[PDB]
Amino acid sequence: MKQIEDKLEEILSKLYHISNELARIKKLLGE
Amino acid sequence: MKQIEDKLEEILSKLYHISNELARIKKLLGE
Amino acid sequence: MKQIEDKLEEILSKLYHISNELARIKKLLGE
Amino acid sequence: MKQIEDKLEEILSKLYHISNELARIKKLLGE
């Protein structure tokens, strides 16, 4: 495991955050 | 677990996507 | 597992670092 | 698990790749 599945869920959530950051950076670069 | 497997796959796959976004940004800045 | 635990921690931690690098880049482009 | 530890190793390796990409992007941005 439950503890491994829970860390995976947290890692995935960081990934969504990073994807959002990249959306913004792209727009700041006019891409 | 199957869920753990799905999540590893999903994490790996989102990481491919992020790696490619970054590669496109690097390509665009290179030009 | 202990190794699996170490690796989840290491992945999570590198993800914090990457998220912050991206945040600094976004901050720098904002200015 | 062995198969989970092996996917974690692969995920970590993508992370190192992304860190390299970010090194280059930073230099392209003069940061």
Swiss-Prot record, chains A, B, C, D:
Name recorded for this polypeptide: General control transcription factor GCN4
Subcellular location(s) per record: Nucleus
Record text on subunit structure and interactions: Homodimer. Each subunit binds overlapping and non-identical half-sites that flank the central CG base-pair in the pseudo-palindromic motif 5'-ATGA[CG]TCAT-3'. Interacts with the mediator tail; the interaction with GAL11/MED15 is direct. Interacts with the SAGA histone acetyltransferase complex. Interacts with the SWI/SNF chromatin remodeling complex.
Regions that span the bilayer: none
Homology family: Belongs to the bZIP family. GCN4 subfamily.
Domain notes: Residues 89 to 100 and 106 to 125 define the N-terminal activation domain (NTAD) and the central acidic activation domain (CAAD) respectively, which can function independently to promote high-level transcription of the target genes.
Disruption phenotype: Abolishes recruitment of the mediator complex to the upstream activating sequence (UAS) of amino-acid starvation responsive genes. Decreases RNA level of genes involved in amino acid biosynthesis and cofactor biosynthesis during amino acid starvation or methyl methanesulfonate stress. Growth dependent on amino acid supplementation. Sensitive to amino acid starvation. Sensitive to purine starvation. Decreases cellular glycogen levels during glucose starvation.
Part of the full-length chain shown: 250 to 280 of 281
Induction of its expression: Translation is induced by amino acid or purine starvation, or during growth in low or poor carbon sources. Translational repression during nutrient-rich conditions is dependent on four uORFs (upstream open reading frames) present in the 5'-UTR of the mRNA; these promote ribosome dissociation. Translational induction occurs in conditions reducing translation machinery efficiency, leading to ribosomes scanning over the uORFs, and increased translation of the mRNA. The rapid translational induction is followed by transcriptional induction at later time-points, independently of the uORF sequences.
Protein purpose: Master transcriptional regulator that mediates the response to amino acid starvation. Binds variations of the DNA sequence 5'-ATGA[CG]TCAT-3' in canonical nucleosome-depleted 5'-positioned promoters, and also within coding sequences and 3' non-coding regions. During nutrient starvation (low or poor amino acid, carbon or purine sources), it activates genes required for amino acid biosynthesis and transport, autophagy, cofactor biosynthesis and transport, mitochondrial transport, and additional downstream transcription factors.
Top-level taxon: Eukaryota
Region (Leucine-zipper): 4-25
Post-translational modification: Phosphorylated by the cyclin-CDK PCL5-PHO85.
